[PDB]
Amino acid sequence: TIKWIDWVKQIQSIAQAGLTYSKDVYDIERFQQLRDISISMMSHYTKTDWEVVEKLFASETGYQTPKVDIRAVVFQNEKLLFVKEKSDGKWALPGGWADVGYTPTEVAAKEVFEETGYEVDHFKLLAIFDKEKHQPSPSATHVYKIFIGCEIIGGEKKTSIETEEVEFFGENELPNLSIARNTEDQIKEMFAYMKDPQKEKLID
């Protein structure tokens, strides 16, 4: 069983919350002890160095919420824009982690420019999917995925020698998907939005 992952995540989150909001020196202290126990459990049951765990799992200030992933949904002539990335050799919509300081649409703009060379605007909110519901894997965190539609208003598509790396793909010729970044049904949903742009915008 790996139910423990969720329990430990909950414990740390509540300890993190306590440390942010408690104003009582003795309870703040209790929360801190509680945070350290959670690091120790995590460190032991993943076989990961304590300080590494503290960094990656318990170094955040303020209340703990899921993290934000942005995916940009760009159509040219009925085909959807994908990028293949280093690790997988598998294809994903342009996007990534949402940066502090940047609005959801700004992250979408930056990631499209960076990953594809295209310049985008006229943004549409299309869906928010829960990562843990749609592409589950044992994970220390929890991820919300915002899909934002964009129109190409400029720039130009990246070029790549000997490797295909940025293409548009049609509904019946989808490439090998990076499931962690987008599931098949998530992609399908964007085509359903394509064929009927006024439909229910999905939220998990």
Which residues between 75 and 104 bind a copy of itself (CB under 8 A)?
Answer: 97-101, 103-104
Q: What span, in angstroms and rounded, lies between the C-alpha atoms of 66 and 132?
A: 10
If binding is defined by CB under 8 A, does position 141 make contact with a copy of itself? yes
If binding is defined by CB under 8 A, does position 128 make contact with a copy of itself? yes
If binding is defined by CB under 8 A, does position 144 make contact with a copy of itself? yes
Q: Is 73 left (phi over 0), alpha (psi -120 to 50) or beta?
A: beta
If binding is defined by CB under 8 A, does position 192 make contact with a copy of itself? no
Kindly state the smallest distance separating residue 135's Cβ from a copy of itself, in Å: 13
Closest to a copy of itself by CB, 48 or 183: 48
Binds a copy of itself (CB under 8 A): choice among 127, 177, 187, 190: 127
> Considering only CA atoms, which of 143, 163, 156 is closest in space to residue 95?
143
Binds a copy of itself (CB under 8 A): choice among 56, 136, 154, 156: 56
**∠ Cα 170 172 174 (to 5°):** 65
Residue whose token pair is 């293409």 = 167
Q: Give the bridge partners for 67, in sequence order.
A: 143
Which residues between 154 and 183 bind a copy of itself (CB under 8 A)?
Answer: none
